[PDB]
Design a protein around this motif. Structure first.
Motif, PDB file in Angstrom:
ATOM      1  N   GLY A  17       1.331  -1.294  -0.244  1.00 26.69           N
ATOM      2  CA  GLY A  17       0.270   0.052   0.200  1.00 26.69           C
ATOM      3  C   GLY A  17       1.062   1.252  -0.478  1.00 26.69           C
ATOM      4  O   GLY A  17       1.537   1.318   0.732  1.00 26.69           O
ATOM      5  N   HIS A  18       0.062   1.877  -0.115  1.00 22.86           N
ATOM      6  CA  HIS A  18       0.944   3.285  -0.625  1.00 22.86           C
ATOM      7  C   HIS A  18       0.258   4.616  -0.806  1.00 22.86           C
ATOM      8  O   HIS A  18      -1.123   4.527  -1.013  1.00 22.86           O
ATOM      9  N   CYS A  28       6.031   7.678   1.569  1.00 30.65           N
ATOM     10  CA  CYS A  28       5.210   6.907   1.896  1.00 30.65           C
ATOM     11  C   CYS A  28       4.900   6.425   3.516  1.00 30.65           C
ATOM     12  O   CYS A  28       6.597   6.280   3.674  1.00 30.65           O
ATOM     13  N   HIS A  69       8.674   1.769   3.870  1.00 28.39           N
ATOM     14  CA  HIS A  69       8.140   1.960   2.477  1.00 28.39           C
ATOM     15  C   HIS A  69       9.700   3.693   2.440  1.00 28.39           C
ATOM     16  O   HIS A  69       9.876   3.160   1.991  1.00 28.39           O
TER      17      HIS A  69
HETATM   18 CU   LIG Z   1       4.015   2.573   0.100  1.00 31.29          CU
END
Ligand SMILES: [Cu+2]
Length: 128
Positions: free
Chosen positions: A45-46, A112, A117
């Motif tokens: 997920g970002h 992020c 991340h």
């Molecule tokens: Cu991310």
């Protein structure tokens, strides 16, 4: 002279931009984030989060501590200037914020907050 930027977050845990310059002529700025990857939101997920370079670490730490149930962002974190929602593969999200929240000569960072991340997914932003 452009008051928007298209940014991508892929399966390589990488953004496709390392630096963003917000033109002073802009009263507002828009970030259009998209995820061209194919991996599930829970594993790749970002989001696009903006804060001063000084506040990045704190935002990232309190973000992962807030869990997925908060898009990895601490609720009411005053350090956050703007942010997009947490998106998964194939999704997109746009955020528009007031440029007046930024000042010349100050170092800002976009990143992020999905755990780990920011090690790769981070870049600079300045008002010029
Ligand atoms: Cu991310």
């Amino acid at each position: 002279a452009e008051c928007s930027v298209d940014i991508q977050g892929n399966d390589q845990m990488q953004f496709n931009t390392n630096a963003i310059t917000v033109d002073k002529s802009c009263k507002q700025f828009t970030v259009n984030l998209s995820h061209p990857g194919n991996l599930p939101k829970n594993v790749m997920g970002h989001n696009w989060v903006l804060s001063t370079a000084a506040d990045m670490q704190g935002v990232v730490t309190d973000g992962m501590a807030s869990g997925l149930d908060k898009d990895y962002l601490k609720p009411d974190d005053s350090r956050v200037i703007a942010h997009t929602k947490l998106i998964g593969s194939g999704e997109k999200d746009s955020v528009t914020f007031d440029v007046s929240k930024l000042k010349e000569g100050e170092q800002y960072m976009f990143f992020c907050t999905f755990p780990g991340h920011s090690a790769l997914m981070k870049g600079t932003l300045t008002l010029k």
